[PDB]
Amino acid sequence: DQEIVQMIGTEEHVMAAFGPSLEECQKAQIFTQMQALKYIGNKVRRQRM
Amino acid sequence: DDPVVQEIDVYLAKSLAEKLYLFQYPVRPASMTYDDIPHLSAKIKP
Amino acid sequence: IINIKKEKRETDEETKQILRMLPKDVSVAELLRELSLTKEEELLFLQLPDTLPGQPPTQDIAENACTLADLTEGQVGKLLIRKSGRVQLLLGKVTLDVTMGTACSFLQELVSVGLGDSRTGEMTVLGHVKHKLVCSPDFESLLDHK
Amino acid sequence: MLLFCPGCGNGLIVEEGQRCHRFACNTCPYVHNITRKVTNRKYPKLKEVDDVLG
Numbered sequence: 027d028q029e030i031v032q033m034i035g036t037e038e039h040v041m042a043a044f045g046p047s048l049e050e051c052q053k054a055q056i057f058t059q060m061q062a063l064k065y066i067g068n069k070v071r072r073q074r075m
Numbered sequence: 076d077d078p079v080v081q082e083i084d085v086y087l088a089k090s091l092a093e094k095l096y097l098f099q100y101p102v103r104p105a106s107m108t109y110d111d112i113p114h115l116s117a118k119i120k121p
Numbered sequence: 122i123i124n125i126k127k128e129k130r131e132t133d134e135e136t137k138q139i140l141r142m143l144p145k146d147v148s149v150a151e152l153l154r155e156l157s158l159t160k161e162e163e164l165l166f167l168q169l170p171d172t173l174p175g176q177p178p179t180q181d182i183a184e185n186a187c188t189l190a191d192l193t194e195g196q197v198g199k200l201l202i203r204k205s206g207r208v209q210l211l212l213g214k215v216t217l218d219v220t221m222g223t224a225c226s227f228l229q230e231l232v233s234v235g236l237g238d239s240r241t242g243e244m245t246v247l248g249h250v251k252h253k254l255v256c257s258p259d260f261e262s263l264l265d266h267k
Numbered sequence: 268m269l270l271f272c273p274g275c276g277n278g279l280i281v282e283e284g285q286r287c288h289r290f291a292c293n294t295c296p297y298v299h300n301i302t303r304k305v306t307n308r309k310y311p312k313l314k315e316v317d318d319v320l321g
């Protein structure tokens with residue numbers, strides 16, 4: 027998450043605005059690439075079989 | 076604007092041309108280093 | 122509490138969130154304080170252009186790219202510091218200019234990974250990298266020359 | 268403020284241990300006990316005293 031915040035910006039208002047997104051991400055158990063890819067695939071619908 | 080001072084020479088070395096790697100930690104500030112952290116192993120591929 | 126493992130602030134230049142109680146430099150003043158103010162050696166990381174103003178010496182060619190892997194050892198160029206802050210690199214007939222790169226604040230360790238044996242090798246931490254330089258061709262002079 | 272673990276870089280939350288309140292990460296056993304007071308002011312913009320028009 028530190029790398030993500032550094033990529034977004036280091037300004038105080040930037041971190042204050044991006045805080046809720048980090049909190050919502052930490053609410054779920056998504057912490058690795060595999061978990062995030064599985065969560066995304068769960069939100070994927072087949073192009074009609 | 077003439078080169079008044081600091082006429083530094085530039086040399087070239089080929090001893091570690093194939094053995095020099097650059098490791099940068101994007102999440103570790105330069106203040107804290109891994110000098111005191113005991114390392115155990117390093118896996119690598121040529 | 123341990124003093125070398127405190128929490129780090131988001132700003133890498135201002136990680137000192139809790140205490141026990143930077144102006145943008147220039148290459149000329151950088152080298153001046155590196156040599157006049159102190160005598161300790163420093164490890165730098167400069168970015169050279171894709172093609173150097175030379176020819177691969179007996180490298181079996183074509184006007185291809187000429188990098189440091191083709192040049193030999195010895196003196197290859199001089200570093201000139203002119204007035205008003207000009208920092209040039211005379212690499213022969215042409216002269217490039219050296220500017221300060223992106224001011225990195227994260228840890229950069231220059232190490233030597235030497236595979237002496239096909240089964241066991243040695244990793245040698247040579248030092249730490251703090252400043253980054255950028256060398257660029259002085260295109261204005263190359264254009265007004267011919 | 269927003270704090271991150273030096274170990275893995277994930278966000279640190281504030282919890283209560285067995286002795287004192289501490290910052291902790293949800294993906295590593297890294298913790299950090301609080302010794303002195305820690306504050307994070309924001310200084311919100313004051314409702315400027317509007318003036319009468321006309």
Ligand SMILES: [Zn+2]
Pocket residue numbers: 271272273274275276277292293294295297
């Ligand atoms: Zn952590």
